[model samples]
Target: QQFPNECQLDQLNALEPSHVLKAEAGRIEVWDHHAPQLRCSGVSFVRYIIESKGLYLPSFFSTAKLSFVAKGEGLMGRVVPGCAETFQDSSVFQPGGFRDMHQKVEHIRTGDTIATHPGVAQWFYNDGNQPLVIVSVLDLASHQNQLDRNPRPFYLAGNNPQGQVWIEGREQQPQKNILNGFTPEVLAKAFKIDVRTAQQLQNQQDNRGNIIRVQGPFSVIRPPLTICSARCTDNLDDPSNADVYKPQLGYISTLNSYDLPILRFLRLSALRGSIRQNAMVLPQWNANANAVLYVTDGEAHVQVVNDNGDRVFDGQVSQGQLLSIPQGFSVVKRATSEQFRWIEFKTNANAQINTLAGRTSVLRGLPLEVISNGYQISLEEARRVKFNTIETTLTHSS
Candidate 1:
């Protein structure tokens, strides 16, 4: 059914194929690809893996930050065999990465849920008897039933430490995406700033944030690659530069490592009205560190070729399809349709090495030879052992 209100539309927009609904006697499934509706046994919400435990988070390979909210009875999780699971119930909301004592917990367990937080982890442990266990619960009564109307009243949107957020009808305010797990009061205490301040901050940050888009069949410019000691660039103080590669048209900036080491977000916002084609736009593998790639929108082909030249993936993925690209391997992405607007989230901001001026600003002054010429260093550049602090790198990258 079409939603009449914006808030209702927000709920509809948040709906994914994974969400299933059950009526009094009929069952229906909402497939991701098949948008409309069809009756079936159950539906899925978000392409997440359900473990033996009820915990469902994004794939480990996803570079995009993930969060969730839990409700109903026995809805919480905790660390196995160690820390007691205490989900913070404060109304204080914050961005995904902010650390708050109230929200601090080794694990989230049933019945103690406050809100979904940033960072993704299916379960704390695996079958190997690990300590980090993913604890979860499911109330049969809470199972989504078809009776729920379009545009779910309750949703899992971004929140901030101050508790201010983008509610369907609330006045627009500055705040980070709702922390999946924030409480109203707690969020207020954390920010200390009034709702207006929070709103302004949120607006400034988002307004200044960049949105990238790209079109199909575009050629990528390959640049020289490099490797060296921390002294080369004061200890990868510029990790973003290390992965620098030139796009035929758009410019790529180095990502800050402190925010999330080895993380990069590139938005391809323009299609130039190109025809759809199954394509990929990255190299085979990243040799420096492990990396994960995610497509927030559009579709494209992807694959990873190992050092041995063996390839994995070789498939197409749209939203939620996160693929891992191991080091020393190559991967590519090509826009699949006219609506091929998308972004590439990777572990390292600087994956493609460049030779042009300040091309590898993150690695400023580091010398990298093209064509496996290996690495060379100036004794002075090598001897400057005092590396820049992670905070410095983060400040500059930001």
Candidate 2:
């Protein structure tokens, strides 16, 4: 079976995340751990639930990842290699004792996406009252990553009694190097640092997991408002930047390359659709990119038609579930609540969707004679079907 129709893979019932690590400050859950279809698509997803005032410790990955801030406001210290440390406090830098010129610690909030490249360091701090919940997807097949499909997350600090491995439920106890694997003597003599400091690096400092909380009068150094940047993050909830805005139908905001230049570099794009109650997303297919859609709110009835002319999926997906539609698979959805909200991530930066039904669609493009004869329907019926919906994408059902 070369492609086995992918009947079951089309609609993933609520992707239940497994809590891999529970730290003092936060917990980490990976959804694609045993998800065969998600890994087959060369992507992986993780959700971080950090308590208020918690700090998701510094870490880097082997693959580029795009993190979506799903809840709460926070500051993230990001380090992109070769990018200058432009954020500076003139009052403190004149003495230059440590010369920690400080990299960019950008402000992040809900609906904003933070894009990070491979091997770049990232740490998050939750300053808001609510828990900071962040979900991220790794581009395992990116040119910046290995051709293989596994998440290789390297922590610069913190220790786990046993780090989780990528396997079918089997845990492998291996790979520890937050300077822990090196000899204390080798580190102390070569670096000219004190033996105690070297020993601190070579030994397990804490039993707490990758993410930890500040113990005492926790005054973690934060950046001032002096940081400057362009397109570091883009909001998916901005109505002014929506590509499709129909007051009655709902709005569809696309955070693509055209809207955010950084997405072009990552070869990724995203769309947030806030479809109104009883409205429908017309029959359409991604022309080039495969779409991984996540239901954020409410329910929707989805139908997918594969290339084999087989109706692969016909069901209602509710909040928290995911639907991965393969490329060129025509799909349509009907909203079930006052607001059926969902967000979709595309593999391609410049996503192109070809609508099968709508005003500016393939049905409307063809001649009435061709449609009537080809489908064996009358001219009036053909016209009715073709011209019934004049809208672009999301249409009012009632």
Candidate 3:
């Protein structure tokens, strides 16, 4: 299937309230629960907004997911399994030494991203006084049987707090547990715990829904290698001479292989593009990776050119929206307001960017005669085209 060059996240229909797997306070909101049918086979974007004190239960996925935290703060926990045991706290559940070695947690805030790979046990909770919003993109296109197997709709953990049974066409039903089939004795034997503990685990859902408030102080014990943050502090109240690419049109900063070594494990890089209103970014392409852009604020008109040099997509996007641009597709963005900003996720760690314009344009390295011959123009005209813009990478378009 041919995927549309752009996807509007906010416009997608919200998941039916009955299908939502969260506690009863109406705290969890989900959009596009399943991968869109019209888009590429297994690619989907799930936008979630959790209210203050909300908690998303522990679960693992069959596929990896990348999330963008666009608002508020929270604490994220995970199970790691291998490092030596150092800080042992019994209050917060410890999965035991190796399971504990695999355990980790992190203090997350706005403008940070979390990467959870396949089969990784992870959970989220809002410790802040305000709501927490996150948009997570899951790519399952690589799997052949993307939607088959028992229980239709994409696979979420059977143990997901929101409930386990799959509903068809918005039908309402009670959530069931995968472990419900196993006797307490069997569960205890499988978990290597006492039968009483197994019975207690089986009865965890008696009080509240999927999301719940914290009864005590929340803290991080073994933080994971998550949270990729943009370190651009140049425009803050107290500014510092940080390394940022600022041009008359806008500025570009990145958290990639070069800066965030932690990304090595996740194999992802992020770039922040902030364009000024009435100004445009010249066409450019990432020569080494595919990318997805999430519009965090403001609105903009985006144009995408396929590898064949055909302008295949052009449209306007606003806040709380997302657009996925494939690798090798040249893209140009123009801001409609002063606050246009976006965070780009690259598939490769070394997201080599190649701009086709400015003094740094690939054409600049060619001999003047070669440039002139290639485009059927005079050497002087070729020189003019190559050197017209002094700004590198991103620049103001006339």
Candidate 4:
């Protein structure tokens, strides 16, 4: 069956705040729909928004998830197993377009991507005055028998009106906890904490809402982490630490498994770039990965080639458009205006790319005789085709 190779978030309606977990001081919104073509792929993109001063309760997912900051400033903290310290970092996102491309502007904080592995405890905070919006994508297909099981969102900490743990979709039903098997004295003695402290911890809040307000420096007290790991903005946004590729048209900064180990399970990598007008990112494809892209600014004329090298998709995209390119499909991107910018999310944690015209290209590595025979051309023609590119990975007109 032919699946949907591309889709846009604008086409779908956002979920009402009432159906989602929300606090008195802020709101939480989400979109969790997937197209028929995307169903078997175990891939679905969810966009969630957190209003200013809002906090997402501590939670973890059964499937791996990746996220991009759409706008505003916030902090994401996670606790990974086996790491020495807990991961906490602050990030800021400023929207940008072609108009601000050459202005040396400081307000356009374009690209900041993050990921959450399976079973990791995570929480989000909107410390800024503006609402913090996040667009997250997850691939359930990558999990074992996940296509058959429903998506699971587990909350580690929550208030229960009936003193029962709450499941995401079945919030109305109260489920008994395994911990209930132990008495307060059993828990206190097992954890070496006093009974009063254990009981206080157990009976902390009466409110059952997931997103709640906290006074005087928002905080979530977690146990001493024996295993923890995190990748933050300080290392991600620093261009000095980024892998930069400069072409005549523009440049791209990338962060992949090679740079961050946390990305291994998610098999995802991220990239953001600035392209000059009429400049095109040459045809390329991840060896074994799919790509999901979001336009940050300006307009782009994009084309994708099928496995047979036939043009299957060609269209123009502007800001807020979500486009998906299937694995191994060749794609070419061109900035239609003076400046174009975008952020890309790759499905493979350790993404491997094959550009059609690069120093590392397969064409460049082939023998001249093989190239000439394959194309039914002369050696001279083959040489010209192989040696014509000026840039190593990304080529552009002078």
* Candidate 2: C-alpha lDDT: 0.75
User: Can you write out model 1's per-residue Cα lDDT over 189-265, one digit (the tens) per residue?
Assistant: 67785655545433333321111111232111112131111110011112244333223222233333333221222
Writing each residue's lDDT as its tens digit, candidate 2 over 1-398 gives 11243333534344556547777888887766346556545577787889977888888998767777877888788887667776653444345454346776677888887777677789998877999888787777678786455677777776765576554444756445467877888889978999789888754657777777766543334345522255657788778988889888889888777876767777777888888899999899998787777787899898988767877678888776777776787889999977898888887878998999887798899999999999999999998988988888878875
Error of 4 at 46 (Å): 2.0
TM-score of 2: 0.87
Better of 2 and 3 by TM-score: 2
Candidate 3 residues 1-398, lDDT tens each? 22353332222221222235555332444434243321322345555566776676665555555677777788776554343444433345545534333244566777666666555566778877888876665544424223422122222222334444333343444443445557989999999999998877664445455456556655445343233232211111111221345555666766665655545554666776667786777778888766767787798888877656566567887786666666677878888867588777676656888778875688778888888999899888998988887776665553
Error of 2 at 344 (Å): 1.1
The CA lDDT of each predicted structure is 0.28, 0.75, 0.59, 0.60
Ranking 2 against 4 by TM-score, winner: 2
Estimate, for each residue in 1-398, the C-alpha lDDT of model 4 and write its tens digit.
Answer: 32343432112111221235444544444333344334423455655567767776667777777777777777676666555433322222335511111101011122567667777666777777787776666666665324433445565554433322222355565422233345778889988999876665453443635555655644332221411434433223445654544545777777777666777756677777778788778778878777777676788888877666676568788776666676777778888877888777777777777888766667889899988999999899999877777565555542
Worst-scoring 10-residue span by lDDT in model 4: 99-108
- Winning candidate number (TM-score): 2
Question: What TM-scores do the predictions have?
Answer: 0.28, 0.87, 0.72, 0.67
- Estimate the lDDT of model 4: 0.60
Off by over 4 Å in 4: 2-33, 80-110, 144-151, 155-236, 376-380
lDDT of 4 at 377: 97
